Amino acid sequence: RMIALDGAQGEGGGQILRSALSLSMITGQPFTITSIRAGRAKPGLLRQHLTAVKAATEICGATVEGAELGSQRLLFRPGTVRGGDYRFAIGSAGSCTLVLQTVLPALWFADGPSRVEVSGGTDNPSAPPADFIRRVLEPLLAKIGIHQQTTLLRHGFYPAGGGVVATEVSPVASFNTLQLGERGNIVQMRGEVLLAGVPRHVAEREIATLAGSFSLHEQNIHNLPRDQGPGNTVSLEVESENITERFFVVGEKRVSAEVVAAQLVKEVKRYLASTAAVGEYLADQLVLPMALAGAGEFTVAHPSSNLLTNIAVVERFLPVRFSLIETDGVTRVSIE
Ligand SMILES: Nc1ncnc2c1ncn2[C@@H]1O[C@H](COP(=O)(O)OP(=O)(O)OP(=O)(O)O)[C@@H](O)[C@H]1O
Ligand SMILES: [Co+2]
Ligand SMILES: [Co+2]
Ligand SMILES: [Co+2]
């Protein structure tokens, strides 16, 4: 029939819509969603979300209502998913990777390989950076039997954007079972600073802060002598025995370089303070792929609203069921 979704679910952001689009294309099940981001400062469909809808529409030849900027209602009726070479432009500093997050799962079930290229923002503060997708998520997808490779072609910063991200995807031959338990011992911690159109000395200060708190196996400075810009992100990649995570902070307008590294340090020690293998963000991004695979599990310290939202949406579209059991401040998310 028709699946009616409440956009106010969880934190009431764009996540429910992106996950809905993915699952609708895959299952063929049509859906309607009201109150899309209705509680936000900038409510309704933004350029990122509209581009996500337009991308999903082009890929499966969908019947759509309300695909417009600021629209808080969408009706989406999917058709047949087609593999191929796709290109989309957000037209702002909107997250390229979140647009990719939307349509990539559908292409896992295509006839042949596909490629999707999206232009826009590349290092948004509240989205997975292309480097996170490539180095954290995708190695885990591969273990599940999903083959996609993401490449950042060009960096785009707020507010101009102009960045470019592309992903290559092959159809899934066979799904597998990935079971992530405790995080296990730390193998390496790599610190990285991205610079573009901002003072050079900034990077050296930020790395010094990191090394004092963890001692980095790598201290990397990546200058972008182009515009590009202006932009600055500080990352910390945490490689443990059974998993690799990555945390980042975007150096902003007013804030000093000394503190942006410090708040990254706090965020990382928070992750380290738990035995949880998966961070709060990666947790919500593993729900759909594990659901589609029919099995799998992971541990996370504190299940976010986006995590629980993705679970709820999945359960509406798929016959899979998630159990969430907490053991000593750590939550095991498993498919029953
Ligand atoms: N630092 C981070 N590293 C990796 N992934 C992240 C990070 N921050 C956010 N994400 C991911 O980006 C997505 C955020 O979804 P969400 O809909 O909340 O976007 P948003 O930027 O909060 O905008 P809004 O919520 O207003 O729509 C989630 O999948 C989350 O896991
Ligand atoms: Co949000
Ligand atoms: Co490098
Ligand atoms: Co780079």
With beta carbons less than 8 A apart as the criterion, state whether 167 and 104 touch: yes
CATH number of domain containing 25: 3.65.10.20
**Which of 273, 295, 322 is a domain's end point?**
273
Give the integer Cα–Cα distance in Å for 246 and 244: 7
Q: Which residues partner with 116 through β-bridges?
A: 86, 167
Q: Using the 3D structure, point to which of 273, 288, 314 is the last residue of a domain.
A: 273
- The two beta strands, 3-6 and 31-34, are parallel
Q: Which of 191, 186, 200, 238 is nearest to 219 (CA)?
A: 191
> In whole angstroms, what is the distance from residue 172 CA to residue 31 CA?
25
What's the helix, strand, coil split of the chain in %, to 5? 35, 30, 35
Q: By residue range, what is the domain housing residue 238?
A: 183-273
Pairing of strands 218-223, 186-196: parallel
- Pocket flag, ligand 1, residue 127 (CB < 6 Å): yes
Are residue 28 and residue 140 in the same domain, yes or no?
yes
The contacts of residue 77 (CB under 8 Å, 6+ apart) are 30, 62, 63, 64
264 and 140 together in one domain: no
- In angstroms, what is the span from residue 114 Cα to ligand 1's centroid? 25
253 and 296 share a domain? no
The Å distance, Cα 190 to ligand 3 centre, comes to 10
What was the structure determination method?
X-ray
* H-state helical runs in the chain: 15-27, 47-60, 96-107, 130-132, 138-144, 201-214, 257-272, 280-285, 287-293, 305-317
For the CA atoms of 58, 62, 68, 69, the dihedral, rounded to the nearest 10 degrees, stands at -60
Residue 48 Cβ contacting ligand 1 at under 6 Å: no
Residue-wise DSSP of 199-259: -SHHHHHHHHHHHHHH--SEEEEEE--SS--SEEEEEEEEEESS-EEEEEEE--SSS-HHH
What number of residues does the chain have? 336
- The residues with which 333 forms a beta bridge, in sequence order, are 298, 324
Domain count, the chain: 2
H or E element at residue 192: strand 186-196
| Structure-block tokens of residue 93 | 């500093």
- Say if ligand 1 is within 6 A of residue 271 CB: no
Task: Return the best residue to mutate from 11, 15, 36, 51 for the ligand 1 pocket (most ligand atoms within 8 A of CB).
Answer: 15
How many Å apart are CA 129 and CA 157, to the nearest integer? 11
Q: Which of 280, 286, 304, 306 is the best mutation target for the ligand 1 pocket, counting ligand atoms within 8 Å of the beta carbon and taking the most?
A: 306
The residue type found at 20 is A
- Co-location of 158 and 192 in the same domain: no
Q: Are residues 33 and 83 in the same domain?
A: yes
Last residue of a domain, one of 273, 294, 323: 273
CA distance 307 to 283: 6
Residues 283 and 267 placed together within one structural domain of the fold: no
Element of type H or E holding 190: strand 186-196
Named by the residue before each, gaps in the chain exceeding 2.5 A from C to N are none
Query: Which phi and psi angles does 212 have, rounded to 5°?
Result: -65, -25
Q: Which of 252, 193, 251, 256 is nearest to 223 (CA)?
A: 193
Q: Are residues 90 and 148 in the same domain?
A: yes
CA distance 167 to 86: 10
Question: Which CATH number is 249's domain given?
Answer: 3.30.360.20
Number of Cβ within a 10 Å radius of residue 327: 9
In 3D space, the residue among 164, 165, 158, 163 whose CA is nearest the CA of residue 231 turns out to be 158
**Is the same domain home to 259 and 147?**
no
List the strands of the sheet with 186-196, edge to edge.
Answer: 218-223, 186-196, 231-240, 244-250
Same domain, 254 and 290: no
Taking the C-alpha atoms of residue 93 and residue 17, their distance in angstroms, rounded to an integer, is 19
Residues 122/133, Cβ–Cβ less than 8 Å: no
Name which residue sits closest to atom 10 of ligand 1, judged by CA.
Answer: 127
> Are 94 and 217 found together in one domain?
no
Residues 260 and 297 in one domain: no
Could you tell me which residues are beta bridge partners of residue 247?
Answer: 236
Neighbours of 320 (CB within 10 A): 18
Residue 189's DSSP bridge partners are 238
Ligand 1 atom 3 nearest Cα: 128
> Could you give phi then psi for residue 252, rounded to 5 degrees?
-105, -160
What is the distance between the alpha carbons of residues 277 and 254, in angstroms, rounded to a whole number?
34
- Same domain assignment for residues 8 and 152: yes
Query: Which is it for the CA torsion 267, 156, 232, 183, positive or negative?
Result: positive
Q: Taking a C-beta distance cutoff of 8 angstroms, is the pair 160, 192 a contact?
A: no
